Amino acid sequence: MERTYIMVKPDGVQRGLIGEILKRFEMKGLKLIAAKFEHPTMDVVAQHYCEHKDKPFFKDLCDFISHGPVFCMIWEGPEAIKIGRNLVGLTSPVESAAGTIRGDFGVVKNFNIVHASSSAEDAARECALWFTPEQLVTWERSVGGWIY
Amino acid sequence: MERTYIMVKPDGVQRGLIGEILKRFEMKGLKLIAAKFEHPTMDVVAQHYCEHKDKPFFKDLCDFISHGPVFCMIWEGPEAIKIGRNLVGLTSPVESAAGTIRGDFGVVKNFNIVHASSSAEDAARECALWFTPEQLVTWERSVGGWIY
Amino acid sequence: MERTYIMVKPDGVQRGLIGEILKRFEMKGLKLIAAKFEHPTMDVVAQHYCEHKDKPFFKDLCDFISHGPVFCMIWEGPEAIKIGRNLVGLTSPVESAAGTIRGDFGVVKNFNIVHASSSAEDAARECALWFTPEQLVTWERSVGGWIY
Amino acid sequence: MERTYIMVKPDGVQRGLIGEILKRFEMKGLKLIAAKFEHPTMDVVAQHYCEHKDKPFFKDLCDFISHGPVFCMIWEGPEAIKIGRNLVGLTSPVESAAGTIRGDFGVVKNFNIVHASSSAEDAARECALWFTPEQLVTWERSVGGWIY
Amino acid sequence: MERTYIMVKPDGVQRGLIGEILKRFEMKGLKLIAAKFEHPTMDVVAQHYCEHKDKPFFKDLCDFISHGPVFCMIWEGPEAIKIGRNLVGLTSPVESAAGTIRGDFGVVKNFNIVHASSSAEDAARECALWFTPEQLVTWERSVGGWIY
Amino acid sequence: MERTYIMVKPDGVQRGLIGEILKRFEMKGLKLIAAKFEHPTMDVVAQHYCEHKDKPFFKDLCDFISHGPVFCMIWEGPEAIKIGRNLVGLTSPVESAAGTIRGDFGVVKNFNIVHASSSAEDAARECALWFTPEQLVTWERSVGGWIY
């Protein structure tokens, strides 16, 4: 039972894919916990990409996301993190199978539409980093017991 | 040039229609300004429904929405308010034409999926009431000039 | 609280529209009670079109449906009958609005894809005529109380 | 039995709507006669829009369309012209109902995505003008006898 | 040339997925032979799942399916069985790729939405068992010679 | 940076799939350069299948396509050729994964709906063979820099 951080990146937003991406997660049956449209701050972006702290691309990459806008979500369910990765596809859209977001919509990795958490450790950081705890929604799905 | 407040209500959320509704607004070409998933407070709900202040249904209605969850949006464009009404349909889904959200998904008015602002005055209140000003996103669509 | 009889006609079946039509009624929120794919008997068709018993086109119309195949459904809900008409469109496709089954898929009256009960009296007859009591399914939807 | 001229205008092409529009005509059941993607010539554009020869907005209207690109189509069927109009919606998208092309995707009237032949007279002119005799395709649909 | 048994399980029906699934089989081009919505009998269920006669999870598995409802189908085509498997995905949805039924809509394996015949042996058993000879529909597609 | 030739074959045209296919390539992000609907000449078909010049099935395959109709497209982008193969699926539909054109719509090799250039060498030949230089459209997408 997990929560994963999913983020429509600026290219996703410019291309009008927010609704499509949300809907794919919703139909999959993960439970929505948090969502918001935003212009991120540089500090949040720099923490988000902390693992790439001192490499040549770091500045350009941070600039691209902090310029925004982005659409932020947290989704909940058994093996949510792996499911997010499955729905999104591989890092390179050219290697992504049709059916996945990247497979269906992306061309080059610089513009791969959407972020999904990579691991339990990344998910734990990302969920707390992008959303304050008052933004987490407690609710119960009448239909939930037929999903898991 | 207007902004309208659009809200997926609890029945919308339970039925898995957040993504579908967002996507219909996105494809229409209105520009997204603000969005968030939330559990509303009674005080916000009571202000939202202020025009029904002292009628028999007021308590039940406020309870239904404040129990939540809801999905909140603001959308921008020429005649956004009228466009929101067009996409959503008439108050009673049974009177709503197929193609509209209510036409395509709703059965009875108590469960009509989604709220759209009714008028310029309602929109002005609703946008400021549901969203703090730091939640409004400034951005520019590369494709915008082909929409309006 | 009503039950309406809905029938994908042979032109609809030939064109691969059974699923699309079932889906529209399902997405609308009506509760499915009954469904089967069949080659109808001439007796049932002749009863179905009994109001036209003594008219010129009667033979051709009966043969058309009895030759089949058809897909039969019963759908339940408040004002299901009116809702059926709303989803299907006007008798002639050139007059049906986009969004409806005929408006989206039909070209001429004789190939108008699908049948919906026209009134309470017709539905009462059609539901019992096309389906036996054994073929009516009693069940309870967990999400049902969010629809009506 | 008519032929109507349908043209995806530059805004339609910029917004990635060619397939969406083609698909809607195709699902409606009209028979495709001709199609091509092109940069139109100024001569053709001024001739197409000749009814507007002496008018303030003529030079801008022509420039917009001849700058291109456009996707040109011919569609065949009983009452094809009226049907084109039904699928597309009214001149102004704000006044176009959901389910039509303009109702689902348009906002303003300068950017209303697609053209449809207005009348029998207009259709005959437009077909002869945007297409050459040898671009018209003769073929027969196996399923066609189930459409009209 | 094969016939495969496809069954929308109770979770599928609860989640409003009957039309979605039918539509995917229909678009794939397999030919529909039989369909019905039913509350299955305990006798049929225990027989269908006989390979699991003596096992801890037998009594719960049968109860789940016989409580119902289910939507039953037969689909015909060259290598229909393997195709059913391809459309549906692997037993566990987490391991099912996007684009399949389970990959797009499933989360856990107890709630994996739909059954598909596993092998030729299984298909012949399942068809004879969930359907009676007179529920099988003989018909011919005009477009069928363009599919196989 | 590549151009790939994509062709809806007669079975695809007969089944109403032109729009669906155009839409998938458009949604993927490749830039449309060329498109037309046509009855192809035997000369062009024979060249198209020249690698099979001296084989038994050659006559039947040539007749099948030359009888037509076909819908021809050229699509541009980084690795367009590989992307074309990815969207279309494996040569045989029973082996193509759900999500692909063949995986979603095809049943057998001979009716596999659509053609995509197989390699750089094939694409270079196919683009010039099926289209004249005059039919290539030069244009610039406002949203283009968000795709690649």
mmCIF file of N, CA and C in Angstrom, chain D residues 53-131:
data_model
loop_
_atom_site.group_PDB
_atom_site.id
_atom_site.type_symbol
_atom_site.label_atom_id
_atom_site.label_comp_id
_atom_site.label_asym_id
_atom_site.label_seq_id
_atom_site.Cartn_x
_atom_site.Cartn_y
_atom_site.Cartn_z
ATOM 1 N N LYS D 53 -15.418 39.923 -51.468
ATOM 2 C CA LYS D 53 -14.413 40.664 -52.273
ATOM 3 C C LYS D 53 -14.112 42.089 -51.775
ATOM 4 N N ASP D 54 -15.151 42.912 -51.650
ATOM 5 C CA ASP D 54 -14.990 44.288 -51.169
ATOM 6 C C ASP D 54 -15.504 44.400 -49.727
ATOM 7 N N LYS D 55 -14.582 44.326 -48.765
ATOM 8 C CA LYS D 55 -14.917 44.308 -47.334
ATOM 9 C C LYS D 55 -13.653 44.549 -46.501
ATOM 10 N N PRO D 56 -13.773 45.284 -45.369
ATOM 11 C CA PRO D 56 -12.613 45.531 -44.497
ATOM 12 C C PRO D 56 -11.761 44.293 -44.153
ATOM 13 N N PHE D 57 -12.398 43.168 -43.833
ATOM 14 C CA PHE D 57 -11.663 41.985 -43.342
ATOM 15 C C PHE D 57 -11.126 40.997 -44.405
ATOM 16 N N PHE D 58 -11.256 41.350 -45.682
ATOM 17 C CA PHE D 58 -10.905 40.460 -46.789
ATOM 18 C C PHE D 58 -9.408 40.115 -46.851
ATOM 19 N N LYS D 59 -8.550 41.140 -46.819
ATOM 20 C CA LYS D 59 -7.094 40.951 -46.929
ATOM 21 C C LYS D 59 -6.501 40.121 -45.775
ATOM 22 N N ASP D 60 -7.055 40.268 -44.570
ATOM 23 C CA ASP D 60 -6.598 39.484 -43.409
ATOM 24 C C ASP D 60 -7.114 38.040 -43.436
ATOM 25 N N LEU D 61 -8.386 37.879 -43.809
ATOM 26 C CA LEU D 61 -9.024 36.569 -43.948
ATOM 27 C C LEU D 61 -8.300 35.680 -44.951
ATOM 28 N N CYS D 62 -8.063 36.205 -46.153
ATOM 29 C CA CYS D 62 -7.295 35.494 -47.175
ATOM 30 C C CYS D 62 -5.875 35.161 -46.726
ATOM 31 N N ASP D 63 -5.155 36.147 -46.175
ATOM 32 C CA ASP D 63 -3.779 35.925 -45.690
ATOM 33 C C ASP D 63 -3.745 34.759 -44.695
ATOM 34 N N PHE D 64 -4.664 34.789 -43.732
ATOM 35 C CA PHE D 64 -4.759 33.745 -42.716
ATOM 36 C C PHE D 64 -4.866 32.333 -43.311
ATOM 37 N N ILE D 65 -5.784 32.152 -44.261
ATOM 38 C CA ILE D 65 -6.000 30.845 -44.871
ATOM 39 C C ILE D 65 -4.909 30.456 -45.879
ATOM 40 N N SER D 66 -4.531 31.377 -46.774
ATOM 41 C CA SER D 66 -3.446 31.089 -47.735
ATOM 42 C C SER D 66 -2.063 30.893 -47.070
ATOM 43 N N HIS D 67 -1.819 31.566 -45.944
ATOM 44 C CA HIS D 67 -0.617 31.227 -45.183
ATOM 45 C C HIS D 67 -0.637 29.729 -44.817
ATOM 46 N N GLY D 68 -1.832 29.210 -44.517
ATOM 47 C CA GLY D 68 -2.030 27.764 -44.386
ATOM 48 C C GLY D 68 -1.407 27.272 -43.097
ATOM 49 N N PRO D 69 -1.251 25.954 -42.962
ATOM 50 C CA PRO D 69 -1.749 24.947 -43.884
ATOM 51 C C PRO D 69 -3.240 24.614 -43.661
ATOM 52 N N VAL D 70 -3.830 23.842 -44.558
ATOM 53 C CA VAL D 70 -5.209 23.426 -44.370
ATOM 54 C C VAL D 70 -5.277 21.942 -44.666
ATOM 55 N N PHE D 71 -6.299 21.263 -44.155
ATOM 56 C CA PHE D 71 -6.577 19.897 -44.607
ATOM 57 C C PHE D 71 -7.935 19.886 -45.310
ATOM 58 N N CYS D 72 -7.923 19.589 -46.620
ATOM 59 C CA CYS D 72 -9.130 19.591 -47.476
ATOM 60 C C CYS D 72 -9.791 18.227 -47.593
ATOM 61 N N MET D 73 -11.126 18.193 -47.602
ATOM 62 C CA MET D 73 -11.903 16.921 -47.701
ATOM 63 C C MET D 73 -13.172 17.023 -48.544
ATOM 64 N N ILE D 74 -13.582 15.894 -49.140
ATOM 65 C CA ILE D 74 -14.923 15.780 -49.719
ATOM 66 C C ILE D 74 -15.610 14.587 -49.112
ATOM 67 N N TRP D 75 -16.844 14.815 -48.697
ATOM 68 C CA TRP D 75 -17.628 13.770 -48.068
ATOM 69 C C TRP D 75 -18.957 13.607 -48.770
ATOM 70 N N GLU D 76 -19.342 12.348 -48.960
ATOM 71 C CA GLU D 76 -20.526 12.008 -49.761
ATOM 72 C C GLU D 76 -21.567 11.314 -48.920
ATOM 73 N N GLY D 77 -22.839 11.658 -49.151
ATOM 74 C CA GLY D 77 -23.967 10.954 -48.513
ATOM 75 C C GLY D 77 -25.318 11.615 -48.743
ATOM 76 N N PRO D 78 -26.408 10.891 -48.462
ATOM 77 C CA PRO D 78 -27.704 11.579 -48.479
ATOM 78 C C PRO D 78 -27.676 12.788 -47.507
ATOM 79 N N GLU D 79 -28.001 13.979 -48.009
ATOM 80 C CA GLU D 79 -28.017 15.216 -47.214
ATOM 81 C C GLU D 79 -26.674 15.464 -46.488
ATOM 82 N N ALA D 80 -25.581 15.246 -47.216
ATOM 83 C CA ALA D 80 -24.239 15.429 -46.665
ATOM 84 C C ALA D 80 -23.967 16.854 -46.197
ATOM 85 N N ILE D 81 -24.571 17.831 -46.855
ATOM 86 C CA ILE D 81 -24.231 19.221 -46.581
ATOM 87 C C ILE D 81 -24.756 19.644 -45.207
ATOM 88 N N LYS D 82 -26.059 19.459 -45.022
ATOM 89 C CA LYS D 82 -26.723 19.662 -43.754
ATOM 90 C C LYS D 82 -26.013 18.870 -42.632
ATOM 91 N N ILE D 83 -25.554 17.663 -42.945
ATOM 92 C CA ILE D 83 -24.901 16.814 -41.948
ATOM 93 C C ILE D 83 -23.548 17.428 -41.530
ATOM 94 N N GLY D 84 -22.822 17.964 -42.507
ATOM 95 C CA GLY D 84 -21.566 18.639 -42.263
ATOM 96 C C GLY D 84 -21.780 19.758 -41.272
ATOM 97 N N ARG D 85 -22.774 20.600 -41.567
ATOM 98 C CA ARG D 85 -23.224 21.661 -40.664
ATOM 99 C C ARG D 85 -23.589 21.149 -39.250
ATOM 100 N N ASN D 86 -24.334 20.053 -39.167
ATOM 101 C CA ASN D 86 -24.662 19.468 -37.869
ATOM 102 C C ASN D 86 -23.424 19.025 -37.087
ATOM 103 N N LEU D 87 -22.439 18.437 -37.775
ATOM 104 C CA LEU D 87 -21.255 17.920 -37.091
ATOM 105 C C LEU D 87 -20.379 19.055 -36.620
ATOM 106 N N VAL D 88 -20.309 20.102 -37.420
ATOM 107 C CA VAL D 88 -19.401 21.212 -37.167
ATOM 108 C C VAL D 88 -19.945 22.195 -36.105
ATOM 109 N N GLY D 89 -21.227 22.536 -36.206
ATOM 110 C CA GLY D 89 -21.865 23.482 -35.266
ATOM 111 C C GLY D 89 -22.104 24.832 -35.908
ATOM 112 N N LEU D 90 -22.594 25.805 -35.148
ATOM 113 C CA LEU D 90 -22.885 27.132 -35.725
ATOM 114 C C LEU D 90 -21.612 27.948 -35.838
ATOM 115 N N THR D 91 -21.634 28.961 -36.707
ATOM 116 C CA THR D 91 -20.498 29.856 -36.931
ATOM 117 C C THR D 91 -19.769 30.301 -35.670
ATOM 118 N N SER D 92 -20.504 30.660 -34.649
ATOM 119 C CA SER D 92 -19.853 31.064 -33.430
ATOM 120 C C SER D 92 -19.827 29.901 -32.392
ATOM 121 N N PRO D 93 -18.621 29.486 -31.941
ATOM 122 C CA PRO D 93 -18.469 28.354 -31.029
ATOM 123 C C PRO D 93 -19.192 28.531 -29.692
ATOM 124 N N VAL D 94 -19.297 29.774 -29.229
ATOM 125 C CA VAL D 94 -19.980 30.035 -27.977
ATOM 126 C C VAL D 94 -21.457 29.654 -28.098
ATOM 127 N N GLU D 95 -21.979 29.769 -29.317
ATOM 128 C CA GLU D 95 -23.360 29.436 -29.648
ATOM 129 C C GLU D 95 -23.518 28.016 -30.202
ATOM 130 N N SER D 96 -22.414 27.278 -30.295
ATOM 131 C CA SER D 96 -22.434 25.897 -30.758
ATOM 132 C C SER D 96 -22.596 24.898 -29.607
ATOM 133 N N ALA D 97 -23.500 23.941 -29.780
ATOM 134 C CA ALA D 97 -23.747 23.007 -28.678
ATOM 135 C C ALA D 97 -22.615 21.959 -28.540
ATOM 136 N N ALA D 98 -22.430 21.457 -27.313
ATOM 137 C CA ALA D 98 -21.447 20.425 -27.017
ATOM 138 C C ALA D 98 -21.757 19.279 -27.952
ATOM 139 N N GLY D 99 -20.721 18.541 -28.337
ATOM 140 C CA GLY D 99 -20.899 17.411 -29.223
ATOM 141 C C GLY D 99 -20.498 17.785 -30.623
ATOM 142 N N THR D 100 -20.644 19.049 -31.007
ATOM 143 C CA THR D 100 -20.196 19.436 -32.345
ATOM 144 C C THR D 100 -18.707 19.753 -32.273
ATOM 145 N N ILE D 101 -18.055 19.887 -33.430
ATOM 146 C CA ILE D 101 -16.644 20.225 -33.438
ATOM 147 C C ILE D 101 -16.397 21.560 -32.749
ATOM 148 N N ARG D 102 -17.150 22.581 -33.146
ATOM 149 C CA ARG D 102 -16.945 23.917 -32.564
ATOM 150 C C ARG D 102 -17.410 23.980 -31.108
ATOM 151 N N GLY D 103 -18.446 23.205 -30.766
ATOM 152 C CA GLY D 103 -18.941 23.210 -29.418
ATOM 153 C C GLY D 103 -17.966 22.548 -28.476
ATOM 154 N N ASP D 104 -17.269 21.517 -28.955
ATOM 155 C CA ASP D 104 -16.309 20.806 -28.113
ATOM 156 C C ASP D 104 -14.927 21.462 -28.040
ATOM 157 N N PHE D 105 -14.470 22.110 -29.119
ATOM 158 C CA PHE D 105 -13.086 22.602 -29.201
ATOM 159 C C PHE D 105 -12.909 24.115 -29.490
ATOM 160 N N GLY D 106 -13.962 24.850 -29.839
ATOM 161 C CA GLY D 106 -13.789 26.241 -30.242
ATOM 162 C C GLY D 106 -14.196 27.253 -29.190
ATOM 163 N N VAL D 107 -13.647 28.468 -29.283
ATOM 164 C CA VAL D 107 -13.923 29.513 -28.300
ATOM 165 C C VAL D 107 -14.410 30.779 -28.995
ATOM 166 N N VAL D 108 -13.679 31.183 -30.020
ATOM 167 C CA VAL D 108 -14.037 32.350 -30.763
ATOM 168 C C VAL D 108 -14.197 32.031 -32.223
ATOM 169 N N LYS D 109 -14.777 33.004 -32.891
ATOM 170 C CA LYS D 109 -15.353 32.794 -34.177
ATOM 171 C C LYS D 109 -14.319 32.950 -35.316
ATOM 172 N N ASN D 110 -13.324 33.818 -35.103
ATOM 173 C CA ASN D 110 -12.124 33.899 -35.953
ATOM 174 C C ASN D 110 -11.289 32.635 -35.974
ATOM 175 N N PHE D 111 -11.489 31.790 -34.966
ATOM 176 C CA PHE D 111 -10.689 30.595 -34.774
ATOM 177 C C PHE D 111 -11.625 29.413 -34.514
ATOM 178 N N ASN D 112 -12.450 29.133 -35.524
ATOM 179 C CA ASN D 112 -13.508 28.152 -35.369
ATOM 180 C C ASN D 112 -13.216 26.885 -36.149
ATOM 181 N N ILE D 113 -11.916 26.664 -36.386
ATOM 182 C CA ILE D 113 -11.339 25.328 -36.573
ATOM 183 C C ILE D 113 -11.524 24.673 -37.930
ATOM 184 N N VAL D 114 -12.741 24.722 -38.459
ATOM 185 C CA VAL D 114 -13.074 23.974 -39.648
ATOM 186 C C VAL D 114 -14.149 24.687 -40.463
ATOM 187 N N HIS D 115 -14.086 24.518 -41.775
ATOM 188 C CA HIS D 115 -15.126 24.999 -42.644
ATOM 189 C C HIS D 115 -16.050 23.868 -43.069
ATOM 190 N N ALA D 116 -17.351 24.161 -43.183
ATOM 191 C CA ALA D 116 -18.250 23.259 -43.889
ATOM 192 C C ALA D 116 -19.099 23.965 -44.946
ATOM 193 N N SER D 117 -19.207 23.347 -46.112
ATOM 194 C CA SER D 117 -20.137 23.827 -47.105
ATOM 195 C C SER D 117 -21.484 24.243 -46.486
ATOM 196 N N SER D 118 -21.892 25.428 -46.896
ATOM 197 C CA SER D 118 -23.053 26.113 -46.379
ATOM 198 C C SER D 118 -24.369 25.683 -47.064
ATOM 199 N N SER D 119 -24.321 25.420 -48.376
ATOM 200 C CA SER D 119 -25.508 25.101 -49.197
ATOM 201 C C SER D 119 -25.102 24.279 -50.410
ATOM 202 N N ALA D 120 -26.079 23.783 -51.163
ATOM 203 C CA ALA D 120 -25.808 22.963 -52.359
ATOM 204 C C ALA D 120 -24.949 23.730 -53.374
ATOM 205 N N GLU D 121 -25.312 24.990 -53.569
ATOM 206 C CA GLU D 121 -24.626 25.906 -54.465
ATOM 207 C C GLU D 121 -23.167 26.045 -54.018
ATOM 208 N N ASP D 122 -22.972 26.423 -52.754
ATOM 209 C CA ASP D 122 -21.629 26.538 -52.178
ATOM 210 C C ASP D 122 -20.803 25.241 -52.280
ATOM 211 N N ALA D 123 -21.409 24.098 -51.971
ATOM 212 C CA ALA D 123 -20.705 22.816 -52.043
ATOM 213 C C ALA D 123 -20.146 22.519 -53.451
ATOM 214 N N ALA D 124 -21.004 22.623 -54.471
ATOM 215 C CA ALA D 124 -20.591 22.386 -55.863
ATOM 216 C C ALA D 124 -19.428 23.293 -56.286
ATOM 217 N N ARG D 125 -19.484 24.558 -55.881
ATOM 218 C CA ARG D 125 -18.411 25.500 -56.172
ATOM 219 C C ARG D 125 -17.132 25.037 -55.476
ATOM 220 N N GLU D 126 -17.237 24.815 -54.170
ATOM 221 C CA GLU D 126 -16.083 24.505 -53.339
ATOM 222 C C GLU D 126 -15.398 23.189 -53.734
ATOM 223 N N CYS D 127 -16.182 22.156 -54.015
ATOM 224 C CA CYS D 127 -15.621 20.889 -54.488
ATOM 225 C C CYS D 127 -14.828 21.057 -55.790
ATOM 226 N N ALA D 128 -15.436 21.681 -56.794
ATOM 227 C CA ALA D 128 -14.770 21.913 -58.087
ATOM 228 C C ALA D 128 -13.502 22.740 -57.932
ATOM 229 N N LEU D 129 -13.484 23.583 -56.908
ATOM 230 C CA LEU D 129 -12.429 24.561 -56.740
ATOM 231 C C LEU D 129 -11.225 24.089 -55.920
ATOM 232 N N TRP D 130 -11.439 23.350 -54.838
ATOM 233 C CA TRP D 130 -10.316 22.923 -53.984
ATOM 234 C C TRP D 130 -9.703 21.600 -54.452
ATOM 235 N N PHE D 131 -10.420 20.901 -55.323
ATOM 236 C CA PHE D 131 -9.979 19.590 -55.786
ATOM 237 C C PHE D 131 -10.000 19.527 -57.312
#
